[PDB]
């Protein structure tokens, strides 16, 4: 009664009415989903036959009891998922046989303590997920000494109310442990003084823990001494929220050393709480889903190297002049905003996509105040009016304008200064190519994606004469009807050419001679009747030629081309599926 998804490998036994592991299933199977079946109990030696099983999903199988040696033969299992089974008590010997387990998920299994959770011999464990249980204590049990590969523990949505000095003793006694800890959705109301002295965490997540501003202040105070690589803080819209959020609640974080700081949704945000002095030395600042309206505060002494602003609500483009910022992200912002000049000397990475962004006077040094920009993403935005061809930004190596409206790009050589550019995407920008010099200066270009545009008179013109280093070129959906003579002659290094979904009446073989390195040519969804111009000239490197969904006139008047299918059979794609029209 199971679904076979990958033969002898993967099998879907979800939502039948199985009371037992079905026994007709192949011995070699690597993946089995058996969730949502009433199994009630795991009998000893149940999975003996599946010696190569790697992933086992038993979520919501109503299991109250695991018997000793249930998993006996499963030496290769790396993932065990037990979510939603009311196994209140786990016997010693519950997990024996799992010699390679790496990921244990025991979410909502009415588990009360980690001390009695018999996982001390799961030496290979990397991830432990015990969210949505009844755990009252934050105590990291001594058997974690056996657990030398463990990197993440999820303690989310439990009943933890206090963190004490003894709670984190294991971590204190073992500074070498690289551990991360999700403590979200626990009603924490007290942290003992000095609890976090001598402790190191990779990632600590504290989302939705606090009901009172006073409690959050005084808890973050006793975080004193902690070294975290990444502290994640904030709340949820569908939960108990803070009444007021003042920058002063953050006091306490001054005695914690933080590499990366992430603020998530906050009910009562104020713009100045990311301007807070105890965040000065953080090297990465992140806002996600935050009601920030303006960012025009930031003192110059602030040591931020990256700022990331995701699904926020800026009404204006933020005025910034941080000497150290190497990386700026502002994406999925509300409404529209119009670009404003910034001053970022260290800036090498800039992602400004998906904001309905307006940009009048793109783009030069005076816009950004850097000489080291290597990456610029301006995709999924509004009108971007080209006014400047990247003077001062010649280190640029990745440029993306996809789906934005480019304006005035054909009025001059807009990319002239970009002698180092490797990747350029101007797909779906409503550009009508009518200037042969549009790609002048792009002598290092490898990838050119220009799908969804058009050309004067719908003829592909001599715009590729200087783009020698091109290995990838996409001209689909460009409404093309014709191809000029020597248009590809220079592209000695070209590996892929997508010319699909155009209006080409026929091909011409002389266009593709000189394309010595062409592996893939894609001419599907055209109106191609036949090819002309001597068929020997098609590249010897041509492995995948797509002529599907075309309008071939099947007769005898173009019988030369119809003969090229035989020896060139493994080279055309979907050969035996093509039909005349």
């Amino acid at each position: 009664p199971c679904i076979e998804v990958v033969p002898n490998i993967t099998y879907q036994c979800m939502d039948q009415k199985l009371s037992k592991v079905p026994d007709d299933i192949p011995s070699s199977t690597k993946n089995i989903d058996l969730s949502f079946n009433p199994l009630k109990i795991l009998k000893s030696y149940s999975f003996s036959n599946f010696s190569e099983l790697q992933w086992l999903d038993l979520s919501r199988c109503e299991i109250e009891t695991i018997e000793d040696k249930a998993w006996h033969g499963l030496h290769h299992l790396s993932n065990l998922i037990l979510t939603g089974n009311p196994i209140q008590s786990f016997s010693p010997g519950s997990f024996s046989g799992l010699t390679s387990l790496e990921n244990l998920v025991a979410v909502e299994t009415k588990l009360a303590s980690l001390e009695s959770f018999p996982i001390g011999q799961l030496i290979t464990l990397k991830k432990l997920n015990v969210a949505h249980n009844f755990i009252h204590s934050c105590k990291l049990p001594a058997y974690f000494s056996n657990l030398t590969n463990l990197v993440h523990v999820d303690l989310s949505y439990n009943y933890i109310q206090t963190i004490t000095v003894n709670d984190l003793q294991f971590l204190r006694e073992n500074p070498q442990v690289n551990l991360s800890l999700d403590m979200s959705l626990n009603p924490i109301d007290f942290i003992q003084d000095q609890a976090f002295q001598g402790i190191k965490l990779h990632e600590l997540t504290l989302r939705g823990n606090f009901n009172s501003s006073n409690i959050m202040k005084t808890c973050l105070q006793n975080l004193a001494g902690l070294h975290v690589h990444r502290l994640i803080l904030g709340e949820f819209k569908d939960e108990r929220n803070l009444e007021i959020f003042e920058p002063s609640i953050m006091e306490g974080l001054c005695d914690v050393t933080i590499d990366e700081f992430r603020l998530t949704y906050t009910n009562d945000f104020s713009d100045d709480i990311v301007k807070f002095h105890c965040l000065a030395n953080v090297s990465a600042m992140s806002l996600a889903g935050v009601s920030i309206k303006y960012l025009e505060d930031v003192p110059k002494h602030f040591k931020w190297q990256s700022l990331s602003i995701i699904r926020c609500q800026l009404k204006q483009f933020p005025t910034l002049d941080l000497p150290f910022l190497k990386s700026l992200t502002l994406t999925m912002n509300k409404g529209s905003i119009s670009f404003k000049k910034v001053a970022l000397p260290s800036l090498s990475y800039l992602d400004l996509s998906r904001n309905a962004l307006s940009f009048s006077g793109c783009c030069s040094y005076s816009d950004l105040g850097t000489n080291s920009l290597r990456h610029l993403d301006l995709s999924f935005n509004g009108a971007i009016i080209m006014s400047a061809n990247f003077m001062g930004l010649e280190e640029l190596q990745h440029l993306d304008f996809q789906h934005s409206t480019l304006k005035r790009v054909t009025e001059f050589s807009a990319f002239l200064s970009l002698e180092k550019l490797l990747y350029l995407d101007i797909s779906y920008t409503n550009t009508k190519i009518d200037f042969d010099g549009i790609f002048l200066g792009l002598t290092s270009l490898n990838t050119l994606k220009m799908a969804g545009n058009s050309f004067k008179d719908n003829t592909l013109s001599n715009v590729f004469a200087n783009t020698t280093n091109l290995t990838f070129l996409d001209l689909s959906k460009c409404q093309l009807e014709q191809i000029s003579w020597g248009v590809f002659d220079t592209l000695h290094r070209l590996q892929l050419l997508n010319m699909s979904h155009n209006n080409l009446l026929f091909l011409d073989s002389s266009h593709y001679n000189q394309l010595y390195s062409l592996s893939t040519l894609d001419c599907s969804f055209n109106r191609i009747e036949t090819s002309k111009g001597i068929l020997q000239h098609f590249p010897k490197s041509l492995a995948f030629f797509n002529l599907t969904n075309n309008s071939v006139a099947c007769i005898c008047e173009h019988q030369k081309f119809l003969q090229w299918v035989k020896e060139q059979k493994q080279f055309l794609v979907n050969v035996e599926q093509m039909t005349c029209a």
């Binding site: 939603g84 949505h132 959705l185 994640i232 904030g234 569908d238 992430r262 996600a288 995701i310």
Partner: protein, 135 residues
């Protein structure tokens, strides 16, 4: 029909999609007034897949004139706004989601909306609700 409420300007009901019937009890307090509503969406179910990347395909029809498929993302997979985004397959979800809106001019009479909930990581359909709105 699984549920209905009447409002001062709409009567809203839903049933399960024909060919996908994984259970969900969903309800709103108060009943949606298309001209503008403040309130909560009450949701109580056990999802048949992870919610980390939950989005919706909405197929909407106005007096048999259909709109292009509309895609609503609710969980992006990173620092998400709603607690349920972290809910795993088989986990009990019981949450009430605030909502608010002012109200555009809507025609006219009879609305059909099928809402497909989808786990973005696997592209597996999670549940499907067939909505009927009379405005």
């Amino acid at each position: 029909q699984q549920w209905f409420c009447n409002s001062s300007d709409a009567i809203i009901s839903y049933s399960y999609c024909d060919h996908l019937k994984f259970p969900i009890s969903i309800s709103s307090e108060p009943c949606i007034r298309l001209r503008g509503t403040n309130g909560f969406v009450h949701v109580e179910f056990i999802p048949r897949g992870n919610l980390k990347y939950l989005y919706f395909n909405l197929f909407i029809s106005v007096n048999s004139i259909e709109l292009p498929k509309r895609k609503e993302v609710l969980c992006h997979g990173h620092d998400d706004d709603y607690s349920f985004c972290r809910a795993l397959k088989g986990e009990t979800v019981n949450t009430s989601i605030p909502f608010s809106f002012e109200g555009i001019l809507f025609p006219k009479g009879h609305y059909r909306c099928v809402a497909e909930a989808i786990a973005g990581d696997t592209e597996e359909k999670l549940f499907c609700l067939n909505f009927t709105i009379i405005h």
